Design a protein around this ligand. Sequence first.
Ligand SMILES: O=C1CCCC(=O)C1=C(O)c1ccc(C(F)(F)F)cc1[N+](=O)[O-]
Ligand SMILES: O=C1CCCC(=O)C1=C(O)c1ccc(C(F)(F)F)cc1[N+](=O)[O-]
Ligand SMILES: [Co+2]
Ligand SMILES: [Co+2]
Lengths: 374, 372
Amino acid sequence: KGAKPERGRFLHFHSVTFWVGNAKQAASFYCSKMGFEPLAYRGLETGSREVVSHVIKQGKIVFVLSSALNPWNKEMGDHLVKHGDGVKDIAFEVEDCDYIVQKARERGAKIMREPWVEQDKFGKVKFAVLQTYGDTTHTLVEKMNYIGQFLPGYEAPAFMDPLLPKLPKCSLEMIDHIVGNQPDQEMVSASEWYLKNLQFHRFWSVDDTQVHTEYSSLRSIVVANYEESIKMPINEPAPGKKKSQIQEYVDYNGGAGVQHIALKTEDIITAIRHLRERGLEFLSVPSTYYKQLREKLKTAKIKVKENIDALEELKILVDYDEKGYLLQIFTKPVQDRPTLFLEVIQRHNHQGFGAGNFNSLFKAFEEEQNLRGN
Amino acid sequence: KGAKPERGRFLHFHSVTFWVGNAKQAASFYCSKMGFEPLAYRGLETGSREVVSHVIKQGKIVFVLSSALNPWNKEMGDHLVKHGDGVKDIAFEVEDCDYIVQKARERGAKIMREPWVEQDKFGKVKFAVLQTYGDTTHTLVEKMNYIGQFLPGYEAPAFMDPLLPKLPKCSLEMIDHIVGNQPDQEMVSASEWYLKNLQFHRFWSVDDTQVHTEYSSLRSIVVANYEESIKMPINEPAPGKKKSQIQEYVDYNGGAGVQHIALKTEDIITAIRHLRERGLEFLSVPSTYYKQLREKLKTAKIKVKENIDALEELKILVDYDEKGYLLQIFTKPVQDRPTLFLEVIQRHNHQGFGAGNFNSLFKAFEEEQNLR
Ligand SMILES: O=C1CCCC(=O)C1=C(O)c1ccc(C(F)(F)F)cc1[N+](=O)[O-]
Ligand SMILES: O=C1CCCC(=O)C1=C(O)c1ccc(C(F)(F)F)cc1[N+](=O)[O-]
Ligand SMILES: [Co+2]
Ligand SMILES: [Co+2]
């Protein structure tokens, strides 16, 4: 949706690396309650004596849970005391890594790790780490004739949970978008980091055409690579009807970081029905939200293929324009700090993110409080 | 048995408080994989703005998973960088909290928190915190006409996991014992801390009537309150045929701490089948252990009521003497660091702790090696 970069390409999201206090229990949690399955493992049993990593997978989504094996680890320890459990690195699978790293250096980005190559019998892979907002980093993955299962240096998982095969499939397929919350007046600079250093462009959608700040208490700029396969909204607090939840994140995260990861699915009724069966908790939606959605769809230009009675019981939200609609629902925070959560989304010819639900939910709670009093 | 202390009494284990990086997911793990159920909760929704605690319960066992809510917490943060996830506090429900604290301070104990009282709609409870080995502490709880579900300041859990009722129950009843590993030459001071300051006594068992050091690589002093409802073995590394795992625990924990918690069941066959169905992992036991077990039982004075074929499939261990036997099995470490693990035990007139299995497993692993 802009100009074309001469060299390099960002294929898609490769993986999301979490830095958690207990990688064993973290990988167990995401497998039990979000439909992930063990893929690879790195730890003491494999020769990695300082850092353990549990690799889990569902569809094309790859999560990495990592913890420190020895005491007095400063880098991982400070990150855990500062943020708690949260996202550390967002990986991009790229083509022509050497130009992307050097052109990013020419534009003034901090190269945290110079390009290096790891190898096993299955091929070679090139990596490189750049620093973005807060302590969040971006690792670049370039497969150079690599054929293995995941990456070199990871063996078969340490343990295969026999409970996972008996649990219903959640049908989560790929990562749609990853939102990074920024502190005050840092949305523009953080969004410029990708346009400047990685030659991204601002992704425009129907959300950019409404003033939702009075109901959202946030400002948002969506940034995307050239092919628009990687989309990452960048948020910052804004004044609004209520105190900004972007500020609540920054206060509890200790700075900038990933607010939520969005996972795209093609069957959100099956996905949410099975995720709730596995025990995952989602946001509360009042009954008046679906009382109002039925009246809206009588005058809307589109028809929803999904059953409205099913959406009401599963507490799934809907946002539409004149040409399509999307279905979305958000989990409760996956930790105790009101920081990181996750989102399940299904798209029906709609490139938005649900900004219309800030006004929709405000009207839904408005009738509910109007009922309890008037 | 002994001479009853003048005043005061230690009723039983109250609870075990963990200091973990994610109290939400930690409480989910013990509920999903060990048969616990949400009991009470403390957090931002309840007014507790600095420490979040998910309280879970199974039988009489009560675990408390706690984390820090605000960034840059020094004490909980340093404990997390040093130990990782592990036990922080072992609580005792006591009678006459004020004298137990007064006698402990008089005998030289470090009182971390003086006796204080909290009160809600269900009654009053008195607390006191003592420091024991390493960074582990001991909270004394005294119920003074409290009738509520747990303790004041805790309300109904934030979320009732809808998957838990669909999972089979694990039939774990109570905490049998809690073991604390000490470095070399600190077993005596740590174990004597309880006899001196709390008027505990040394608990002796059939394990103590033999020397198992060449196969266990550890020394142990088991401490118990007067009523012997609270048992806490205190370990230290000792030279032996293999690398001391009591030493490897201290190396990865940064000092003394709780090595494992033991949970008692009255049906270990059902417990282990359901724990394995829920996804809990246990230690590997070679098949030659059960070939040798059936040969030992042809001569033993006792008869094991449980199916030997079931013990072999579930990888449960057996230790017996001339008057009874116990069944036990150990989980893999509940973290990636080889520090804390857990044990499930069923007792059939046997007051030991399984010291004979070090020798039994060593001979079993040796026969597997020569037959490969
Ligand atoms: O996808 C992001 C893009 C930036 C703004 C942010 O609000 C979007 C979230 O997905 C989103 C969308 C809607 C809602 C609502 F209104 F339904 F609550 C909430 C969020 N959210 O969790 O930030
Ligand atoms: O319960 C403790 C008491 C102190 C000594 C210790 O060995 C006891 C453990 O339960 C125990 C018993 C047996 C084994 C064996 F030999 F099977 F590995 C291991 C442990 N243990 O993990 O401490
Ligand atoms: Co989103
Ligand atoms: Co034991």
